[PDB]
Design a binder for these strands. Structure first.
Ligand SMILES: [Mg+2]
Ligand SMILES: [Zn+2]
Lengths: 653, 1319
RNA sequence: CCGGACAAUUU
DNA sequence: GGGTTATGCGTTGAATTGTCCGG
DNA sequence: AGCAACGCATAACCC
């Protein structure tokens, strides 16, 4: 490769070959006039060093330098290592027809579609635009097609729309971790230079919007396109391939809107009346003659799948609210009503979505999830929660508690200085009393935030759940946990020191009143420890997962049944405390070897070549089986692979 | 009492702790480092003089010549900063050193004959540092970062963790000099002492101790203790010491004076020890086995036959006992062994040692340092004496000797600079004592054991290395000289020194690239500390102790403004009040505290001194005269803090802002945010971008004025006076009569740099801030640079904030903006992209710059001229030709503007090398530079001569004044008037000769400028001319950019919201910025709501004042309102008196504060909730600050009130059009048939192994095969697929991987046979 | 073309 | 009388990318 | 011309 000017930049291999050829020529010329033994031995030694430097530098002795201070590379050092061919060009390689930009949100699309810039879509689909133009006849040749694409008058936009309506793309993230990393969506021509992905898949990607870069790839062959529509679709990979929890998880804004919806109160505007249906309920809520959450007996009408596929309609009355009825209007067909009568928390809505999926199916389930997202965002926009400095309340007993804490600390210090106890027990007493005071402050502030605000009941007083912003945000499972709200409101307790121990002088104040420089420096180092070790932790995790995926790859299901009666004896794993993994989640979907009999007196339950599912799990739970002899992948005896009978149900299906 | 220029905008400040020490110059570290680097200080003393006085005295082998040195001077640089950076030359000054060479005659000790004295010889051109602390290498601007490394001396580690799975703790010593070989005193689990040179292999220590001119008996008597034996008729007595037996347990019988004290199996305790000291009987009875277990030291022969009885360092036995009993000896010196007092490590080492003589020891040393070489005795002796007792290859420093003496517990801190036998003995004794149990070790993460470097010390070390490298050739040429007929400049050499200093100042791991896109970033990078350069640690060979901050990081290293990525914890910063110690430590100021009165006198304490005394906390309640109101106060003693009393304290912190840095100091309410959140906030404030209007902040810390003054981005007036002519290009300051010097008193001219480009493609502009006819003081702000306003660093802007979810547009942490922001044009930043043009002279002639280019277009040539260069001020877009270039074949090779940056050409510079005929365009361009230079010089001469005539007429006015001879005769004849020949006449004559020399300097400078413009500059050997064009792209807010704040919260704009859709209050004012309340529990920023409330109070006060000023009210009401607003609060230090102001000053103050009220908030003592509520109650705002709003779509009152307010935000240097990239089909690589990568070059993505594994986990095979074989590897398959797509057919075909082909070809070129077989 | 340096992300 | 254990040297340490500029 | 951790590789035990 040349450089700036007529001079050409030398290469490592070129220099090594030049040195070897020069040494060979010198040896051949010197072995003509009968050169002495010392000179020919020195020449042979130099030629040996030259050929060693050409083959493999750094292994034998020192590494010869081809520059000022950088060690020269050889064929062995270029092939092996991190920058080798196997890791730089064979497996990992650069591809075309791809883009990258900053993502946004755009909460106005369905699930099997995402956002993508208009100019980027025109640039990525240039061959498709050329083909469509040449098949329509509006272009003369490739030069005319290039001129039309670079001019952009009016036909190119509709041609791009035509090719976008029926061409899914595959977005891509750089740090992929699990299987769900490259999905399939449908672009929409949106002005701008950013990507508008669905907010529900962000929690699945463990992604955010802090200027992150996302890549996109577009298939261009019919088999890969069909494979994408069958497997890579977000409306197909709902169930997670690890456990049984699906991937469509309601986001924090959605769960906050639903929690504000189904939050019943003791008195509101229009409490103590009856109405016909949720239709009139939402009408009255929009008119303003009735509150959003008010106890009103509304007649409901649902269906049930008690028959063999046929649904039975029924009509009854239930004492509920208005928001609950409005949320019930978007329910699909066959679901009970006792699922929208509680507070509808994060685990509650997760269980409800899982139950709706497993009872009805897939397409109405994803439609219901999209509708839930829409209605949650809409009601969040309608209400809007706001955190206030007055909404955050400091307990009035925190001063007295910390005063008693300092008094006990001073008493222990004086008793230790007087010559009674040792520094070890003094430090133990200090840490335990400080932990006790921190836990007391935390529980006090939790009780305050959970029942601070009260309302009337058309005549007297009544205590209920507090209508505080932080309390709602902590109870709906949106953002923040118990320790999180503790750190936000009250004392953070003690925190460890870099060596491994913990500081005997904890934090006195919280974040609202005022910390000192000393406590700030303590928290600084306590957080910097983690902020420094997380990088090496991620590096070690990446190395471990690479080693695992490299050591366990050659295994393809080649047969259906091997015809063996071996496996692992399933026993309930118990570690000191209680049952960790339940038997249902343990043998959920796995064909057993022999005929598993009922634990009764010689009663056959399930056969030996059948798939186990939820019904069989319920039967096993009713029969109370201790251990179930099921097959195992390591117990399977299949030549070059593992049969499908020694695995059971496929995950994510 | 305050200043007069500060009356334009006084910032209200809160707080309760009165400050005592002001803020010094933040570039003081670089200034003192450079002054220590270059200085004419005599007697050496760590500098160029010291290096010269240390290395120059060098004699000759046989030349009979000695070259000395007297002093050295410096010359004036050929180019100054401005035009130096404009061209691209290294801003350096010629260094001249005067030397003398003497020559003596043979057969005489020092009989000289004739000596030559070289007058100012050259030895290298070293670059000078400007006032801003920046260096110039090749027209750029780089700052050398200080280095934190290990102090030269002796250290004692433990290396616990890898103890061969034994659990035994080890203690090793590490003697590290300043420049020489190392010395490690390692240990073994088998109780043995070993040494090593340059960390090669394990070697015994007794061999070195003997080679240090010492025998076995002397070594043993010097290290171990003597146990004298005596021989009588019976009961062989032994001299034992209780201090010796305090470790081991004497299991034998002990009796004295006929009384048995210790029997068999009684353990000796403290009472036994005191009884032994009281008896002092060193003549007891010992068993025969203990004598055999003892080790004799010296040799012993027979008393009759004279035969050697026992050898040196060997166990005794019954035969030797009988031999000593039959002899007549009375004194036998023996060693002493113990397990918890003194181990016989030297005894086992000497036993393992096969040698026993110094000659064999030296032979073994020579054989181990260079095998395959005859070990000569003289050569080995010279090698052993040249490693530890030399003055060239081994030398320490003053700080090294001080640390060595401090670790060895000596008395003097000075002395010699090399290692000595006594020092080796002392270090070995200390290591033995540490291994025995007594004495602790020293760690590495402590600040009292490390040492910081500087630019001056590092440059001195590099210069010394180059000089000691060239001294070899100097001495060789001096020895192989002549007979008193040479030349000093011909015998001296300086090319290695020049190359060394050039590579050190250019290519260095510490001398990195500066980022001048922000004054805060500049002032942080000027004090950044990095322990990454040579002499310290790397990036992958680090653990946890070097990453986590040691508790001694108090007021010196800031733990906040630190980066995050590959290297976390290594890159640090420096505190505000932290200074550099005289030895190279890290100093911090501390107020001297008496027994009960806190004196304002400060006292500096180092790292080794802070751990001895107790210092109280900064934020502590105290009286006005410095008296502790409370009894208990939190203090510290050795890093670990605790709680002490009142009469037990010694010192106290100076201020509360010393524990934090200066870049992180611009975060209001740092105590309200978490550590990591404040860290990322300080980082994102460092990487910022100036907006269009530098709007004043409303919740500033208070040090913004000091930061803007200390920075070099503004024009500070040197000597104050009266301003007469204000302009946006030059400022003229007429000084008052107070500051009038009898020689060159003069006017003050300050130039203003216009729109130029910074390092990160950012624009920097200086705007004036003074009025016509206004007095000024010394040290006054006159211009405002980037992100500055009236001397205050104003980075971001001020917006209306509110906190409510809105249709999910703010998902997890997204930011919502309104259309009013983009309508008023207030975040439209200016970016200047650097485009480089190159015109070479290759085959078939050079590349001409003419407009006669075939196959062109009139629409494209209309923007160009008849040369091929666009005019100044034309708006170009993506796809236009800027500078026209053609290559003879003729092929067009002009410079094209990249796609995506619609900028504007504002300046075109052509640098033609001397010797090329210029065309008419270059001629007219040169004429334009000459014209503007002549105009500038003429106007400068005009203003200077106007000042000279004003001065001389003011001198003639004082004394004899004659109006007739002043108005009748012309102005040119003002030399012979009625005036007494005194000091006034002296001033007139000196001003006359000053005007004469100014016109002479004007003529000389005009000639020099003409010569420099006519001549050519220096370029690369192969290029003719170069064109540097600066663009001007107007970047507005576009959906995808990156908004954030001063608390760590991040934001990405999703979609703009109209004014009609944004919510509005009861008055009708919509909100502009809406965040997400869900980001508060995640990222701990409790200070965000406090800043919001403060912004409401400040905006309300400013709007109230503006309304009162607009409705036309008298000055009394405005004065009362301002007085109340400035005196509200509990107890603040800002005490103003409005009764001593004028009506115009109040009118101007109200007019300036009509658009907001700046409120100060120093870091750990800002405003409180009580003051915030009081200000809100004074203003027309509610107490809670949570007002009820109206919906923008429908329009109704919300269920609960929402939080709205004002927040100071800013824009990051990340843009959507700069972070976006896309490619469908382009060029590929050459070595491997794969597409390229990057944005500047038309490249794509990279389908890596992790996503390949993801596709493997998926049930997809054809897609991955298409991605890995068709898109990049198979060129034929890619072309066929592209043809089928453009033809209207959908078929894919596999192919051979070119990467696999390359791999197999390489493995075939190697020594491995692989092939492809066929079935 | 290979490294050096800074920096985003893995919070 | 062969074989048990300190010593010397071999391998490696996630992912993709906007920047600077040097030989 | 300063890893860190762990394994394989010569050349001495001590019966
Ligand atoms: Mg992000
Ligand atoms: Zn099987």
């Amino acid at each position: 490769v040349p450089l700036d000017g007529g001079r050409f930049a030398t290469s490592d291999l070129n220099d090594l070959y030049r040195r070897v050829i020069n040494r060979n020529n010198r040896l051949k010329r010197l072995l003509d006039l009968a050169a002495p033994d010392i000179i020919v031995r020195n020449e042979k030694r130099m030629l040996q060093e030259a050929v060693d430097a050409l083959l493999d530098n750094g292994r034998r002795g020192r590494a010869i330098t081809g520059s000022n201070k950088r060690p020269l590379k050889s064929l062995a050092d270029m092939i092996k290592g991190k920058q080798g061919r196997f890791r730089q060009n064979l497996l990992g390689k650069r591809v075309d027809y791809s883009g990258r930009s900053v993502i946004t949100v755009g909460p106005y699309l369905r699930l099997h579609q995402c956002g993508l810039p208009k100019k980027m879509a025109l640039e990525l689909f240039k061959p498709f635009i050329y083909g469509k133009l040449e098949l329509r006849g509006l272009a003369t040749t490739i030069k005319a097609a290039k001129k039309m694409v670079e001019r952009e008058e009016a036909v190119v936009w509709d041609i791009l729309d035509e090719v976008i309506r029926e061409h899914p793309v595959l977005l891509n993230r750089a740090p992929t971790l699990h299987r769900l990393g490259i999905q399939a969506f449908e672009p929409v021509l949106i002005e701008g230079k950013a990507i508008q992905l669905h907010p529900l898949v962000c929690a699945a990607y463990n992604a955010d919007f802090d200027g992150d870069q996302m890549a996109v790839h577009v298939p261009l062959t019919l088999e890969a396109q069909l494979e994408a529509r069958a497997l890579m679709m977000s409306t197909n990979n709902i169930l997670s391939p690890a456990n049984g929890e699906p991937i469509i998880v309601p986001s924090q804004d959605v769960v906050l809107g639903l929690y504000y919806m189904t939050r019943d109160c003791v008195n509101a505007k229009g409490e103590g009346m009856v109405l016909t249906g949720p239709k009139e309920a939402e009408r009255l809520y929009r008119s303003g003659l009735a509150s959003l959450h008010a106890r009103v007996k509304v007649r409901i009408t649902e269906y049930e799948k008690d028959a063999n596929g046929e649904l039975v309609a029924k009509t009854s009355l239930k004492d509920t609210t208005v928001g609950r009825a409005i949320l019930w209007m978007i329910v699909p067909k066959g679901l009970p009503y006792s699922i929208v009568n509680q507070a509808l928390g994060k685990k509650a809505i997760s269980k409800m979505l899982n139950t709706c999926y497993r009872i009805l199916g897939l397409k109405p389930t994803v439609i219901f999830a999209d509708q839930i997202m829409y209605t949650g965002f809409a009601y969040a926009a309608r209400s809007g929660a706001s955190v206030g400095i007055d909404d955050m309340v400091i307990p009035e007993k925190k001063h007295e508690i910390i005063s008693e804490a300092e008094a006990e600390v001073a008493e222990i210090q004086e008793q230790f200085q007087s010559g009674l106890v040792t520094a070890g027990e003094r430090y133990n007493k200090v840490i335990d009393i400080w932990a006790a005071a921190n836990d007391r402050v935390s529980k006090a502030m939790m009780d305050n935030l959970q029942t601070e605000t009260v309302i009337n009941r058309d005549g007297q007083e009544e205590k209920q759940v507090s209508f505080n912003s932080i309390y709602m945000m902590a109870d709906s499972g949106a953002r923040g946990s118990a320790a999180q709200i503790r750190q936000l409101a009250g004392m953070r307790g003690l925190m460890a020191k870099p060596d491994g121990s913990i500081i005997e002088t904890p934090i006195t104040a919280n974040f609202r009143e005022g910390l000192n420089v000393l406590q700030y420096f303590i928290s600084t180092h306590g957080a910097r420890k983690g902020l420094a070790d997380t990088a090496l932790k991620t590096a070690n995790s990446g190395y471990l997962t690479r080693r695992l995926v490299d050591v366990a790859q050659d295994l393809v299901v080649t047969e259906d049944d091997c015809g063996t009666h071996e496996g692992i004896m399933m026993t309930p794993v118990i570690e000191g405390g209680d049952v960790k993994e339940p038997l249902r989640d343990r043998v959920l979907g796995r064909v057993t070897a022999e005929d598993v009999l009922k634990p009764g007196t010689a009663d056959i339950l399930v056969p030996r070549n059948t798939l186990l599912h939820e019904q069989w799990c319920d039967l096993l739970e009713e029969n109370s089986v201790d251990a179930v002899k099921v097959r195992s992948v390591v117990s399977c005896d299949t030549d070059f692979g593992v049969c499908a009978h020694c695995y059971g149900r496929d995950l994510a299906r | 009492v305050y200043s007069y220029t500060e009356k334009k905008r006084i910032r209200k400040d809160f707080g309760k702790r009165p400050q005592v020490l002001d803020v010094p110059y933040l570039l003081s570290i670089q200034l003192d480092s450079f002054q220590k680097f270059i200085e004419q200080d005599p007697e050496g003393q760590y500098g160029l003089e010291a290096a010269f006085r240390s290395v120059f005295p060098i004699q000759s082998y046989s030349g009979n010549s000695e070259l000395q040195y007297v002093s050295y001077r410096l010359g004036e640089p050929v180019f100054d900063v401005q035009e130096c950076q404009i061209r691209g030359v290294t801003y350096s000054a010629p260094l001249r050193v005067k030397l003398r060479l003497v020559i003596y005659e043979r057969e005489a000790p020092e009989g000289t004959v004739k000596d030559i004295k070289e007058q100012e010889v050259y030895m290298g051109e070293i670059p000078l540092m400007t006032d801003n602390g920046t260096f110039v290498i090749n027209g750029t601007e780089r700052v050398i970062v200080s280095q934190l490394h290990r102090s030269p001396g002796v250290f004692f580690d433990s290396d616990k963790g890898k103890t061969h799975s034994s659990g035994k703790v080890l203690y090793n010593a590490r003697i590290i000099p300043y420049r020489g070989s190392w010395l490690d005193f390692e240990f073994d689990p088998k109780d043995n002492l070993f040494v090593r040179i340059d960390r090669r292999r394990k070697l015994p220590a007794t061999i070195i101790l003997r080679a240090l001119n010492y025998t076995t008996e002397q070594i043993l008597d010097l290290f171990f203790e003597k146990v004298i034996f005596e021989i009588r008729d019976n009961k062989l007595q032994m001299e034992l010491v209780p201090e010796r037996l305090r470790g081991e347990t004497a299991s034998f019988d002990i009796e004295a004076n006929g009384k048995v004290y210790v029997e068999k199996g009684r353990r000796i305790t403290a009472r036994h020890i005191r009884q032994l000291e009281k008896d002092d009987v060193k003549l007891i009875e010992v068993p025969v086995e203990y004598i055999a277990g003892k080790v004799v030291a010296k040799d012993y022969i027979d008393e009759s036959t004279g035969e050697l009885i026992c050898a040196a360092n060997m166990e005794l036995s019954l035969d030797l006992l009988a031999k000593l009993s039959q002899s007549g000896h009375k004194r036998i010196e023996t060693l002493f062994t113990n397990d918890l007092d003194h181990g016989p490590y030297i005894s086992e080492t000497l036993r393992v040692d096969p040698t026993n003589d110094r000659l064999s020891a030296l032979v073994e040393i020579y054989r181990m340092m260079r095998p395959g070489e005859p070990p000569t005795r003289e050569a080995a002796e010279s090698l052993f004496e040249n490693l530890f007792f030399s003055e060239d290859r081994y030398d320490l420093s003053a700080v090294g000797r001080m640390k060595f003496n401090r670790s060895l517990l000596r008395e003097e801190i000075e002395g010699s600079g090399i290692l000595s036998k006594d020092d080796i003995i002392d270090v070995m004794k200390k290591l033995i004592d540490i291994r025995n149990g007594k004495g602790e070790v020293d760690d590495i993460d402590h600040l009292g054991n490390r040492r910081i470097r500087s630019v001056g010390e590092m440059a001195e070390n590099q210069f010394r290395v180059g000089l000691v490298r060239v001294e070899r050739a100097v001495k060789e040429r001096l020895s192989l000289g002549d007979l008193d007929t040479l030349m000093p400049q011909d015998m001296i050499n300086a090319k290695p020194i020049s190359a060394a200093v050039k590579e050190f100042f250019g290519s260095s791991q510490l001398s990195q690239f500066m980022d001048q896109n922000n004054p805060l970033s500049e002032i942080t990078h000027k004090r950044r500390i990095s322990a990454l350069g040579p002499g310290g640690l790397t990036r992958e060979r680090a653990g946890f102790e070097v990453r986590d901050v040691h508790p001694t990081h108090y007021g010196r290293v800031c733990p906040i403004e630190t980066p995050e990525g590959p290297n976390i914890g290594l890159i640090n910063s420096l505190s505000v009040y932290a200074q550099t110690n005289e030895y190279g430590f890290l100093e911090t100021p501390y107020r001297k505290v008496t027994d009960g009165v806190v004196t304002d006198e400060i006292h500096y304490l180092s790292a080794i001194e802070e751990g001895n005394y107790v210092i109280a906390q900064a934020n502590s309640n105290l009286d006005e005269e410095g008296h502790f109101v409370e009894d208990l106060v939190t203090c510290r003693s050795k890093g670990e803090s605790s709680l002490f009393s009142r009469d037990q304290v010694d010192y106290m912190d100076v201020s509360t802002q010393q524990v934090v840095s200066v870049g992180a100091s611009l975060i209001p309410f740092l105590e309200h945010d978490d550590a990591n959140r404040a860290l990322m906030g300080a980082n994102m404030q460092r990487q910022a971008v100036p907006t269009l209007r530098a709007d004043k902040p409303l919740v500033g810390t208070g040090m913004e004025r000091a930061v803007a003054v200390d920075s070099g981005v503004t024009a500070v007036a040197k000597r104050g006076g009266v301003v007469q002519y204000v302009d946006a290009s030059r400022i003229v300051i007429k000084v008052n009569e107070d500051e009038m010097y009898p020689g060159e008193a003069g006017i003050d001219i300050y130039n203003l740099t216009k729109y130029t480009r910074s390092n990160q493609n950012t624009c920097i502009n200086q705007m004036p801030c003074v009025s016509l006819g206004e007095p000024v003081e010394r040290g006054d702000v006159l211009a405002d640079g980037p992100s500055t306003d009236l001397g205050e660093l104003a980075l971001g802007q001020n917006m209306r904030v509110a906190f409510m979810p809105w249709n999910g547009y703010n998902f997890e942490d997204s930011i919502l903006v309104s259309e009013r922001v983009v309508q008023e044009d207030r975040f439209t930043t200016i970016h200047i992209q650097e485009l480089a043009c190159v015109s070479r002279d290759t085959k078939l002639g050079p590349e001409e710059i003419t407009a006669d280019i075939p196959n062109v277009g009139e629409a494209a040539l209309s923007k160009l001229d008849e040369s091929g260069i666009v005019y100044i001020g034309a708006e170009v877009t993506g796809g236009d030709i800027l500078v026209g270039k053609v290559t003879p074949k003729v092929k067009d090779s002009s410079l094209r503007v990249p796609n995506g940056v619609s900028g504007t050409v504002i300046d075109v510079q052509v640098f033609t090398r001397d010797g090329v005929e210029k065309d008419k365009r270059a001629l007219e361009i040169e004429e334009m530079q000459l014209k503007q230079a002549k105009k500038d010089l003429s106007e400068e001469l005009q203003i200077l001569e106007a000042g000279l005539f004003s001065r001389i007429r003011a001198v003639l006015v004082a004394g004899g004044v004659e109006a007739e001879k002043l108005d009748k005769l012309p102005r040119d004849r003002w030399l012979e008037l009625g005036l007494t020949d005194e000091e006034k006449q002296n001033q007139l004559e000196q001003l006359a000769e000053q005007y004469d020399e100014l016109k002479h300097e004007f003529e000389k400078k005009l000639e020099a400028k003409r010569r420099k413009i006519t001549q050519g500059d220096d370029l690369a050997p192969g290029v003719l001319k170069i064109v540097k064009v600066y663009l001007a792209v107007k970047r507005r807010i576009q959906p995808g950019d990156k908004m954030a704040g001063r608390h760590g919260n991040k934001g990405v704009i999703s979609k703009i919201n109209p004014i009609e859709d944004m919510p509005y209050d009861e008055n009708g004012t919509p909100v502009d910025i809406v965040l997400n309340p869900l980001g508060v529990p995640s990222r701990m920023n409790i200070g965000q709501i406090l800043e919001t409330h403060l912004g409401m109070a400040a905006k309300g006060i400013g709007d109230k004042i503006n309304a009162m000023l607009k409705q036309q009210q008298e000055v009394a009401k405005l004065r009362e309102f301002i007085q109340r607003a400035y005196d509200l609060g509990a107890d603040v230090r800002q005490k103003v008196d409005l009764s001593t102001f004028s009506d115009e000053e109040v009118m101007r103050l109200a007019e300036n504060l009509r658009k907001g009220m700046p409120i100060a908030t120093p870091v750990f003592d800002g405003a409180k909730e009580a003051e915030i509520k009081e200000l809100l109650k004074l203003g027309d705002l509610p107490t809670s600050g949570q007002i009820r709003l109206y919906d923008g779509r429908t329009g109704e009152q919300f269920e609960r009130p929402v939080t709205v307010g004002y927040m100071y935000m800013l824009k990051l240097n990340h843009l959507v059009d700069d972070k976006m990239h896309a490619r469908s089909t382009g060029s590929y690589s050459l070595v491997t048939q794969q597409p390229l990568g990057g944005k500047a070059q038309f490249g794509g993505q990279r389908f890596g192994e992790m996503e390949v594994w993801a596709l493997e986990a998926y049930g997809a095979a054809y897609t991955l095969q298409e991605m890995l074989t068709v898109k990049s590897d198979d060129v034929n398959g890619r072309t066929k697929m592209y043809k089928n797509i453009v033809d209207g057919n959908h078929q894919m075909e596999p192919g051979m991987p070119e990467s696999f082909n390359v791999l197999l070809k390489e493995i075939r070129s190697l020594g491995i046979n692989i092939e492809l077989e066929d079935e």
